[PDB]
Structure formats: C-alpha cells, structure tokens
From a paper:
Here we report the discovery of a multichaperone condensate in the ER lumen, which is formed around the chaperone PDIA6 during protein folding homeostasis. PDIs contain one or more catalytically active thioredoxin-like domains, which can reduce, oxidize or isomerize disulfide bonds in client proteins via a characteristic CXXC motif. PDIA6 consists of two catalytically active thioredoxin-like domains, domains a0 and a, which are followed by the inactive domain b of unknown function. The PDIA6 condensates recruit further chaperones—Hsp70 BiP, J-domain protein ERdj3, disulfide isomerase PDIA1 and Hsp90 Grp94—which constitute some of the essential components of the early folding machinery.
The dimeric domain a0 is connected to domain a by a long positively charged linker, and domains a and b are connected by a short five-residue linker that presumably restricts the relative domain motions as it contains three conserved proline residues. Domains a and b unfold cooperatively, suggesting that they are stabilized by interdomain interactions. Titration of the paramagnetic analogue Gd3+, however, quenched NMR signals specifically in three structural regions, thus revealing three cation binding sites (I, II and III). Binding sites I and II are located at the domain a–b interface and in domain b, respectively. Taken together, the Ca2+-dependent phase separation of PDIA6 is controlled by a molecular switch in domain b, which is activated following Ca2+ binding. The data thus suggest a functional model for PDIA6 condensate formation, where the positively charged a0–a linker dynamically interacts with the negatively charged surface in domain b at homeostatic Ca2+ concentrations. The multivalency required for PDIA6 condensate formation thus results from (1) the high-affinity dimerization of domain a0 and (2) the transient Ca2+-dependent electrostatic interaction between the a0–a linker and domain b. PDIA6 interacts via its domain b with the nucleotide binding domain (NBD) of BiP. Importantly, the BiP binding site on domain b does not overlap with the interface required for condensate formation such that condensate formation and BiP recruitment by PDIA6 is simultaneously possible, as observed in cells.
Author numbering: 270 to 419
C-alpha cells in the first residue's frame, strides 16, 4: 500500500504540464526527440521505450519525465542550450535551484542510465537554466503516434 504513484511520461503539450511536472518532482528529465519526419513512429517509440524503462527503474526517486519534439519548444531548447548538437538531447532540471545538467553520453539505455546514476548520486555538473526562470512553453497538439506528414 505504502508505495508512491506510478511514473508518468508526458509530452510537453502546454505550460501547465511542463511547469507542474518540474515543480512537483525534485528532478525532471526532459527529452527532446528528433522531428517525427526524421524518426517516424518506429524511431520515436524506440526512444520513448528507453525512457519508459528507465522511469520504471528509477520510480523510487519520484522524478518527473517530459518529452518534446525538436523545434516544438524552441524557447525551452534555448534555455537549456539544446539545438546545436542535433537530436535526441536530454536535460535534467532541478526546478527548486533552477539549474540543469545535459546528457553527454549516448541517448541509449546505457548512456541515460549512467547520466541518471550520476544524478542520483548528486555528483554531476550543472548550469543555471537560461535567464534563471522557467522558460515559456507553447501549446502543442499531442503526437498521434504516426509517421508525420511529408
């Protein structure tokens, strides 16, 4: 009975989802996946499946889990220094101290796990979120799960 609720992996479809997720968890993991036309559904689901597995592995940390598409939240990318080294990219935000760390290993189960493990041990490099405030978040329709158009 005395177990915390299941993880949730939420697409960043509006500011309330993003800000509440980061304010209600000590750390929030933000994945910026490639545009759907780069991966299609199969490639996007490969990345989402990695996030879902690690969210379960780390469920006792009670972290938040967010994902978005390249270019869909440009101001968020800028505030996290994302966009210049391609996609996928990952940041972990500490909302309380308004700081973040970027994944520097592979966007894979092994690479993200090493990233998260360092964070669970609280021994990784951080930087202030750009401007010292939570970035503006734009409203987006949720991904329909298909391969995009074009």
């Amino acid at each position: 009975y005395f177990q915390s609720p299941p993880p949730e992996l939420l697409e960043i479809i509006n500011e309330d989802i993003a800000k509440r997720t980061c304010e209600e968890h000590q750390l929030c993991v933000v994945a910026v996946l490639p545009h759907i036309l780069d991966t299609g559904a199969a490639g996007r689901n490969s990345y989402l499946e990695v996030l879902l597995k690690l969210a379960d592995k780390y469920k006792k940390k009670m972290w938040g889990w967010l994902w978005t598409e390249a270019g869909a939240q440009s101001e968020l990318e800028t505030a996290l220094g994302i966009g210049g080294f391609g996609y996928p990219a990952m940041a972990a935000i500490n909302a309380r101290k308004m700081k973040f760390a970027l994944l520097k290993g592979s966007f894979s189960e092994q690479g993200i796990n090493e990233f998260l493990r360092e964070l669970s041990f609280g021994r990784g490099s951080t930087a202030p979120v750009g401007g010292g405030a939570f970035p503006t978040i734009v409203e987006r329709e949720p991904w329909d799960g298909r391969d995009g158009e074009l």
